[PDB]
Structures are given as structure tokens and as C-alpha cells.
Amino acid sequence: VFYKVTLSRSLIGVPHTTKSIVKSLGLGKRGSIVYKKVNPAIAGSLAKVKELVKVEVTEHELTPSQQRELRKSNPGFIVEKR
């Protein structure tokens, strides 16, 4: 299974050591989402930044394209040509 990791809090005031831990996890700007294969190595890294992130276990992995298509809003119309 996979971990769904969200950078809830920002890295403005965190020490550079914590910043390095987060950067090596693939997380970028605040609110970024990355799907990490569950692994004792990953669990340790998330344990050290347990505050700044929010972690939920998920069955499958969503590619970034899949996430975008799931994030698009619903236009309230179907265009009729002419």
C-alpha cells in the first residue's frame, strides 16, 4: 500500500535539517501531494516531520495527471455547436 503525504504546514521557520528531510521526500510548496510506497525507510522520515505533514493510508497510487482530472471543477453546461 501507499502513503498519501500532504505538506500542511509551511517550512518558513523550520530548521534546515527538517527542510532537508522534507525536500528529499519530494514535497514542494505547501499543500503539495505525493504518494509514497509504504516502506520502513519512508516511515522514519515521516516520523521526524510528523507535525508539518498529514498522512493517510491509501489503496492505490494516483499519478499527477489522475489527480488533476479528479480536481477539475464541474462546468454547468454542454456547448451546442450553432
Partner: protein
């Protein structure tokens, strides 16, 4: 100390609610980290995701950090901490040997759960 840093010595009721929420979120992160390890190990043994979640046996973590973070003595859960430890920290240069938690830099992010037994 001419410059005025008007930081009060007590928190408002709303800061306390947020502090309790932040502690719970951290505990939930730990609870989820262990859950993934248990599910991953169970899948390795051959089980599927569903039965892994319903398995009576829950594989406890083996890493030192996660094993200790799951010990209430070392890292107590929000429902287990005392009110003093939730909102007050330990300073050895303060009257009462305690100071408001909000005075700790980056208190919102940093986690201070344990205080000396008699202080």
C-alpha cells in the same frame, strides 16, 4: 526592555482548542504510519488489503523511532496528557519552573509533550 513585545502569559480559549487539535493531528499521523507498516507487512505475507485491515493481529513497528513514538510514557497522546503539559512548558529560570507554551518559538510546529516528573 523598552521595546514592547505584548505577548500575554496566558492563552485564550481559542488558542487552547487549536493546540488540542494540533496534538491530535500529530497523534493521528503516528497512528497512520503504524497502520501502513502493518498493512504492508500483511500484504508481504500474502494477505490482501481488506483482510489486512480486519486482521486480529496488528503487527507493531520495529523501528526505534516509531516504537518509542507509540509509547505513552515517551510520547503521550492528547487524551492522555495533563492540562498543564498541554498548555505549559518547563523553564528552569521562571517562577514556578513553568512558562506558557505559546512563548516557545514555533510552538505551533514544534512538539513538546513530556515534562520532568516532579516539575
Amino acid at each position: 526592555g523598552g521595546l514592547l513585545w505584548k505577548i500575554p502569559w496566558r492563552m485564550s480559549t481559542h488558542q487552547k482548542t487549536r493546540q488540542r487539535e494540533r496534538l491530535r493531528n500529530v497523534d493521528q499521523v503516528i497512528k497512520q504510519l503504524t497502520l501502513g507498516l502493518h498493512v504492508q507487512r500483511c500484504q508481504d505475507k500474502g494477505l490482501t488489503y481488506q483482510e489486512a485491515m480486519e486482521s486480529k493481529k496488528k503487527y507493531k513497528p520495529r523501528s526505534k523511532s516509531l516504537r518509542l513514538l507509540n509509547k505513552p510514557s515517551v510520547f503521550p497522546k492528547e487524551n492522555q496528557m495533563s492540562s498543564k503539559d498541554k498548555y505549559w512548558t518547563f523553564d528552569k529560570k521562571a517562577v514556578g519552573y513553568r512558562k506558557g507554551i505559546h512563548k516557545v518559538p514555533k510552538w505551533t510546529k514544534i512538539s513538546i509533550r513530556k515534562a520532568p516528573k516532579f516539575f
